[model samples]
Target: ELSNTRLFVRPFPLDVQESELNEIFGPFGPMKEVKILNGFAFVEFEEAESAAKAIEEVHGKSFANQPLEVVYSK
Candidate 1:
């Protein structure tokens, strides 16, 4: 049904910040929350469609140096 609203982002920058995540993934759509841990992150949007778009557009993208590995949360 493609109803997932959270995107799992790996290869998350060691010095990552909530604002940093917001800066990158926020523009795709409305954000709900952001979490960073163990060099990875969970980026949640307000809707599944936005999350899907974020995954498709941001996956394989690099944050200046470290490339992103974004996928569905579950």
Candidate 2:
């Protein structure tokens, strides 16, 4: 299994330390942090499955008035 806990999310609207992101991914499992970047953010989970579940559950879904592009990250 992949040891990565980071998930790549981009093309989202600005604003948030952990709102829609935490609410979205937090349900799956324990998470580390929600790092922000230009037009993108890095979401880290305590477990791989947390990130994995978030990807499938929220990926391609619209949030913050924008479609969230979620995937595995470095």
Best by lDDT: 1
Give the distance in Å from residue 34's predicted Cα in candidate 2 to where it truly belongs: 1.9
lDDT of 1 by residue, 1-74 (tens): 34478898884555667777888897899988888886678888998889999999989898858667888877
Q: Candidate 1, TM-score vs. the true structure?
A: 0.85
State in Å the error of residue 11, model 2. 3.4
Error of 1 at 71 (Å): 0.3
Q: Model 2, poorest ten-residue lDDT window?
A: 11-20
Candidate 2 ranges beyond 4 A from true positions: 1-3
lDDT of 2 by residue, 1-74 (tens): 34478888875565654676777777888888788766677888888878888877778887767777888887
Give candidate 2's error at residue 31 in angstroms. Answer: 0.4
What's the TM-score of every candidate structure? Answer: 0.85, 0.79
- Itemize residue pairs with steric clashes in candidate 1: none
